[PDB]
Design a binder for these strands. Structure first.
Lengths: 49, 108, 108, 205, 149, 95, 78
RNA sequence: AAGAACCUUACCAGGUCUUGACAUCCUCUGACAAUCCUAGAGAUAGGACGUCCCCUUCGGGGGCAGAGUGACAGGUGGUGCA
RNA sequence: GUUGGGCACUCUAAGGUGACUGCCGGUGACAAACCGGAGGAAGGUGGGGAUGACGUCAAAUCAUCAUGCCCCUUAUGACCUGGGCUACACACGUGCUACAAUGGACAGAACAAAGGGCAGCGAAACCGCGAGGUUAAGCCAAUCCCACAAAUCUGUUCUCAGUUCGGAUCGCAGUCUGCAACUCGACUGCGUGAAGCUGGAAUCGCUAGUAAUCGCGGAUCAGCAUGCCGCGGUGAAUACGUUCC
């Protein structure tokens, strides 16, 4: 719970890890990739391009 | 001779004024505009009247030793407070937050 | 009037031949204004020259996309494809010059 | 290493668990889903549930929890279900539904299979044996291939090294082949061991 | 294994010469064919104003004098180091014609490229200058080691 | 009446529009048949830098497929029939 | 920003305004290296934290407009 | 890890707290709290100001907080020849 | 298109068809093949991405995370404030801009695609030399806003100069963002104007919409791009041959 608004940083809302976070999903590259695979991320499928 | 500087004869006026310390392109442009004189005329092809007018406009500006001194008293001022910038001035390192590890050679 | 869609790159030219005097008008301008290069203009006319319909038809193109070269190729392709609607006898002469092939060379 | 077979076969032959459109609610509706599925795991750690399909409809959130033990799942009169719902109702915020279908032949689903082997390795059933029960059960279930792997300090063996008993075919070359995959971790008194379980279940034509 | 077909360039629209186009593409830098189309049409107006002849009469004459007949090719069978005299294929003649024309035109002292290219063509046409010399040079060298082949 | 449908699977989105159109045509109102609207392609590129500068790329993609359904000369039964229809969990029915 | 005016920590400006009531006298210790030197500071010695110790910097006229941290170099190198 | 001013942040120097930041309970269950006054560089503080938990056949329990509480909690400290 | 205007075309995107040596000449086992026909947008493996096997390095990671057993466990837990990560004798990588004239400046024309936006994009007017500021249209959207290109083409001037080459650095200037830009943001004034007169030995890679080149957008993000990822524009040269490596 930071003091000012600037200090407030995006953390992986599942991991807790404060890195690499995708604002659309609030996930780091890791937690996302894993869940993407399982297919728990409504319409986000692996691409071929 | 303008502001104690022998500006070249062959090149255009605008260019010849860029040599005058304290005058660049845009200063030379608004000098000659304020002189009410064509900026395409040549120094060799100017008039002594037109020179006088150009010279009168340039007297309102800080140029040459007047400006060199203004700049030099600032070097004094920073080494007269031991400011980060002061120390960077006397050490010969970057003063505005440039990295030193590499790409600092202008200073070094 | 005789319609024919051309495409090169991202350009898409809606060519239309109308009975005229060999004027190419692209988006309500003379081709010289729209396409500057003479080399491009010659290549745009290349379907009209080989069918010997240069001076038969007024070309009314509607182009959108790509650049000036691209826009050319689409017009060329669309003139060629318009001529086929004018006279199916031209197919043989066009096809020999490679004008009926759609240049599908996209970026990698 | 390798592509996760499911990874590359979703929206192709297999389906989304999380069936729902949502624009500005995406992250809200998503992280909710993550609780819901993480809860039903911790709750029903022994009910043979895998494909916890989550649908949504403003405030009518439906949770289909496909289960190989459906009689066990419901509970004594929907006892487990109702208690599950009220927590989820108090956690999520919505009208959490509980539609339930069965995982007929647990050895067809690779999560359940890999979960079965997850327990055997905890209770110290020889890596050797653990798999072979599954393999043969999966064969009789009616599966054209299987590739159980266990990897780690196997039997407390100081040196960790991997042991895989593979039957049938694992056609990863075929995008239309239904390769199920499921990983699991086996925490014994010498670290953890990796249950990886592939299952080709006939082509999707 | 089978000789790839060379790309069929269009004819130069005002001289109807695929040679002149090939010069443009040789002169073109950073895909700026416009700059090179201008330069040549500027250079050929310079040739026509000076000589009075058609630029095509001069340019073809220029190429004749630049275009090589025999070239040195390194052959190192066992020892050898033989500079095998090789006859320049008619496509490689024009290649080396236009390459040298452009390469030496850029190196000349004149201020603008349109003048530099014009003067190199005018010098080439008079059987002189540097690009003609370069052909001679490799032939002098090919004549020097002519005992191989 | 103007309807916008949005989905991640174009199959269910087509099966939706079929019913939306068929329910309006049984209702008797004239339908502008389902306009295909420019499908939105959000691509997510997770790079894992190797040797710093080379970087193993893995791309994911979300496609929002869109359909526009205008209903001309609308009816009471239409307005009802639209609210009656159950478009699935993967479609967003905006009116 | 430059429309808002020069910056100074209100915690510090209070301390120095108390000294401006009296005659300089006390020496203020602060961690506000980021505070601009105002004319009110002139004559004071300000103890400014350089990351480990407080550097006593006497405030002269030419130091006005600069920050306090300009006179407390944080990195040691010869 | 060419999106480090603070934050990030791990490092440092100094200030500071020690169920310790958090964490399970154990229970005790109040309000928890906002709050703005005074400090302080801020944390850490004391308090100006301000406490009503809901559900409760109104017992309890779900909680939250503080306290007590207890093993622990928690370690970017080890081992990637577990 | 501004509006009425069916909606033709184009575009949007669901569903289809289309290339097969299929058909026709030669050739050759009468076949396969090969050579060439036509037809077609496409010709003989349509072109791109996606998806391999069993490998070994007890390769690397307990600074993604988790982890059995160690250790710390009023500290090897935790919190704050300032500072450092941004130091610079130098080294090894990656990259950008110059070293001008096929260029610099000056103005007139232009012609893109992809992508982003409501806690925002912000039109458009308005203000300032400019960066920005004002207020606020319209629009979470093929509807509105960001973008709506730059290279380039055509006018004009300088004229091969350390230069209207070049931009470093420094001085004095402003403006945003944030609690705060001293260390340590970016941007814009204005002056200054470094090196560089186009990078050897050597080393790597590349057969076309490629090399080269010029712009655009986006993620991360308060702000911060000579990085990364898209997108489009312009657009080559060479491939004889297998003699050698």
């Amino acid at each position: 719970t930071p003091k000012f608004k600037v200090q407030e940083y995006t953390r992986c809302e599942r991991c807790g890890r404060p890195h690499s976070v995708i604002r659309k999903f609030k996930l780091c590259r890791i937690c996302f990739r894993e869940l993407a695979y399982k297919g728990q991320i409504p319409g986000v499928k692996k691409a071929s391009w | 001779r303008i502001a104690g500087v022998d500006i070249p004869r062959d090149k255009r006026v605008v260019i010849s004024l860029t040599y005058i310390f304290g005058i660049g392109r845009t200063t030379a442009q608004q000098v000659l505009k304020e002189a009410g004189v064509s900026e395409d005329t040549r120094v060799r092809d100017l008039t002594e009247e037109e020179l006088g007018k150009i010279r009168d406009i340039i007297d309102k500006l800080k140029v040459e030793g007047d400006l060199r001194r203004e700049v030099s008293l600032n070097i004094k001022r920073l080494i007269e407070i031991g400011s980060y910038r002061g120390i960077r001035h006397r050490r010969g390192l970057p003063v505005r937050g440039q990295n030193s590890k590499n790409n600092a050679r202008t200073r070094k | 009037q005789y319609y024919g869609t051309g495409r090169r790159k991202s350009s898409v030219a809606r060519v239309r031949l109308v009975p005229g005097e060999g004027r190419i008008v692209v988006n309500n301008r003379e081709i010289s204004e729209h396409i500057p290069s003479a080399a491009l203009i010659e290549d745009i006319k290349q379907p009209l020259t080989l069918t010997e319909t240069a001076g038969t038809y007024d070309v009314l193109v509607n182009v959108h996309g790509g650049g000036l070269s691209g826009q050319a190729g689409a017009i060329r392709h669309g003139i060629a494809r318009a001529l086929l609607e004018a006279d199916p006898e031209y197919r043989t002469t066009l096809k020999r010059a490679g004008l009926l092939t759609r240049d599908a060379r996209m970026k990698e | 290493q390798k592509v996760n077979p499911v990874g590359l076969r979703i929206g192709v032959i297999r389906d989304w668990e999380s069936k729902w459109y949502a624009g500005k609610d995406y992250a809200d509706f998503l992280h909710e889903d993550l609780k819901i599925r993480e809860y039903i795991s911790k709750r029903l750690s022994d009910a043979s549930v895998s494909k916890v399909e989550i649908e949504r409809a403003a405030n009518r959130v439906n949770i289909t929890i496909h289960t190989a033990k459906p009689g066990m799942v419901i509970g004594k009169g929907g006892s487990e279900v109702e208690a599950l719902r009220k927590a989820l109702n108090s956690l999520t915020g919505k009208r959490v539904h509980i539609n339930i279908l069965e995982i007929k032949r647990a050895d067809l689903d690779a999560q359940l299979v890999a979960d079965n082997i997850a327990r055997q390795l905890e209770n110290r059933v020889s890596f050797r044996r653990a798999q072979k029960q599954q393999i043969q059960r999966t064969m009789r279930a009616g599966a054209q291939g299987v590739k159980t792997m266990v990897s780690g300090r196997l039997g407390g063996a100081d040196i960790a090294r991997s042991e895989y008993y593979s039957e049938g075919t694992v056609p990863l070359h075929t995008l239309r082949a239904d390769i199920d995959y499921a990983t699991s971790e086996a925490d014994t008194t010498y670290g953890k061991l990796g249950v990886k379980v592939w299952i080709y279940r006939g082509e999707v034509l | 294994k089978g000789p790839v077909a060379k790309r069929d360039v269009l004819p130069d629209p005002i001289y109807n010469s695929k040679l002149v186009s090939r010069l443009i593409n040789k002169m073109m830098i950073d895909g700026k064919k416009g700059k090179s189309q201008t330069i040549l049409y500027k250079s050929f107006d310079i040739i026509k104003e000076r000589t009075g002849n058609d630029a095509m009469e001069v340019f073809e004459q220029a190429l004749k004098n630049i275009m090589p007949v025999l070239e040195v090719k390194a052959r190192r069978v066992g020892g050898a180091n033989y500079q095998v005299p090789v006859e320049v294929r008619p496509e490689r003649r024009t290649t080396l014609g236009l390459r040298w024309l452009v390469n030496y035109a850029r190196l000349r002292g004149e201020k603008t490229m349109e003048e530099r290219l014009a003067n190199e063509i005018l010098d080439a046409a008079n059987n002189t200058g540097a690009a003609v010399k370069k052909r001679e040079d490799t032939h002098k060298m090919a004549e020097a080691n002519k005992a191989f082949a | 009446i103007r309807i916008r449908l949005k989905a991640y699977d174009h199959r269910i989105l087509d099966q939706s529009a079929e019913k939306i159109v068929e329910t309006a045509k049984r209702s008797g109102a004239s339908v502008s048949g389902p306009i295909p609207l420019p499908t939105e392609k959000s691509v997510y590129t997770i790079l894992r830098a190797v040797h710093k500068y080379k970087d193993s790329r893995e791309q994911f993609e979300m496609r929002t497929h869109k359909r526009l359904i205008d209903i001309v000369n609308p009816t009471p039964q239409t307005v009802d029939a639209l609210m009656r229809l159950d478009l699935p969990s993967g479609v967003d029915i905006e009116i | 920003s430059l429309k808002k005016g020069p910056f100074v920590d209100g915690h510090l400006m209070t301390k120095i305004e108390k000294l401006n009531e009296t005659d300089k006298k006390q020496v203020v210790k602060t961690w506000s290296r980021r505070s601009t030197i105002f004319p009110q500071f002139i004559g004071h010695t300000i103890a400014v934290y350089d990351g480990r110790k407080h550097v006593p910097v006497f405030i002269s006229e030419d130091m006005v407009g600069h920050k306090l941290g300009e006179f407390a170099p944080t990195r040691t190198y010869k």
